[PDB]
Design a binder for these strands. Sequence first.
DNA 1: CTAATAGATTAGAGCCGTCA
Lengths: 469, 100, 100, 50
Amino acid sequence: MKELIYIEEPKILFAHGQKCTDARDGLALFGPLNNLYGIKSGVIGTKQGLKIFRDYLDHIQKPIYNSNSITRPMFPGFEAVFDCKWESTGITFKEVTNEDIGKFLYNSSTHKRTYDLVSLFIDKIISANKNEDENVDVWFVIVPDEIYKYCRPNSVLPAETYNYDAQFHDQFKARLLKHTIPTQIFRESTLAWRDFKNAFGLPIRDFSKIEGHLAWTISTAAFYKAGGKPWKLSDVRNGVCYLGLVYKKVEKSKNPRNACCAAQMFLDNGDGTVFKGEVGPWYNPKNGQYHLEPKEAKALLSQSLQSYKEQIGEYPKEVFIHAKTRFNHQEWDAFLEVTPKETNLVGVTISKTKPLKLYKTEGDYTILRGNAYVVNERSAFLWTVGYVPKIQTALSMEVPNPLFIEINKGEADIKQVLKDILSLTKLNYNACIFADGEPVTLRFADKIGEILTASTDIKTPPLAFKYYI
Amino acid sequence: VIREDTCKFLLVSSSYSNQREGVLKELAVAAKVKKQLKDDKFIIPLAIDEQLSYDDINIDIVRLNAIDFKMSWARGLKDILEAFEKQKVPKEVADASKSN
Amino acid sequence: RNKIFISHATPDDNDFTRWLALKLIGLGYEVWCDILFLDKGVDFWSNIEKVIREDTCKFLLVSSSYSNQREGVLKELAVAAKVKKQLKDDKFIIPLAIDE
Amino acid sequence: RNKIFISHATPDDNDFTRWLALKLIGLGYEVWCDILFLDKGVDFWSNIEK
DNA sequence: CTAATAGATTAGAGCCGTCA
Ligand SMILES: [Mg+2]
């Protein structure tokens, strides 16, 4: 018989120093940390897109319900939750004629038409930013479905612009990076889903029972992208820094030339939460290899340590490098040649490709969430997806898979590593969910890497997450 | 508790609470208590149901000045707080730990 | 909607109200009155509101120094005003001045 | 018997009525308006007549 | 450098379900 261990929920913090395990409940009960006054939005799109956005804004000023209030908390209105004004009166419109959109989406080349459409939108956005008086917090880009259908890299149509990714979203977000304009992209079938139907009279996407969930997600994203703090972690210890490393394939040239990006998280020391990308993309020329050369590893670790020191005033007492790969001896020797003497560097690998499933012998409900199986002093399985008794349901549909956490390098305690990994699953500001299945250090770094891989002209990019997510 | 402890009678008016036996009996008791004391502003309706027209209200509260909640709940909460401050409803220091 | 409702103050204006009800019954009309048709042991506010809202063609009010500023009379007047607005009849309410 | 009564349409004239009432109060005149002086939970027609 | 046989580890795309 093998023995399992349980790990308790980490809890998150809200206004008035009140702790809760859910973000929806804590937002409906207490409210967010900071005090915004109101969101002034800029809307660039067609006329019908503008009307759709206005209707949606008018829709979320009132309570919106789900089918079940236990499985899914309801939405009591934007001003009831966030204590700020986001209404369809502080809107500036930048019209985009439909004839231009039709004209540019026909060139029979994905790269060229994608470049033309991104140029069309960002030209108006940039011109409005540079030479106008109205102040805009977030720019809402409404996109028709015909643009979304044909602009994927593997989309079939029934040189100068070839040095870009063939994806509209990533190229759009990368080409606006040097201007630092927070923007949110909406499809036209997302805000008005009742009108778009298939050839049977029914909506293609049915949000009838999950309208409140969509309102929660959209409102939280809009609030965060406008400079609002929705919540923060409540049990982050002092002197510990979390660093996530993610690799991507640059490609789009002769050299695959792998690239690496980082994300950093630590405590502000003012009881805040510092959580920002640490990225100047570091390159490896050899194909298929996901390890840093000594120079790049030294540069990355030096930059991260200097950032922590400048923010806090002292070097960290503990550095956890979470990664999806293993480390070699050259990598870690380069890492250790710049680390200060009185600092502990632990390198942890979080893997998902490891088959193991636990079945309850009687019921039709899966294993409890915070269960873990410790193979050895340096390895353990952890269930981040599973049944949550608070909401009377699980975070998946079939039998969930656990994460295989291995202390690859250094000397640490596996139980504390599991506790920190479970705590890190409660910071997905790009969503409004009970909890994530992966630590956010390895997810936002991936998002940053996939954003600053769609262009080659980016230099000294911004680090705030609101310019990528 | 209605006769000896209550200081304000907040009623939630909707398509469900209209013509409900327990609600009507509690309203009758509250009206008797309001007559018993010198307080005309003892019962406060709060309208929340968009399907409950202002002309379809039960005879007990047709003549009362209500607080509107349909278009948004934040301004309704602000109106309730302002009314309570204007009518000097008893209260302690603010603390969100009790609700928690 | 063929019942003539009579609103008055009980029991200060019972003589005139009973006289008028008996006369209108003798002439052939259908009259609902507080002192002649209300049942014993029935929820009376609900029944009165139902009578005013569902079956009532005229609202004859008895106006005097007593019926002025009376809670029951005023509530009936409010509900009858709602019914008049819903019915688009500008002569739904008719006062009868009997006090010098 | 020293209160100025402002009658108006609602909610079409609340902007001008609020401006005028605030100006009159600032100048020292006692003003009654349902926008700013009608208590919640009261018999409002009787109060207005009174 | 190079063509096969394994094991073991990595990233990339793309589709489907969320009620009950
Ligand atoms: Mg987002």
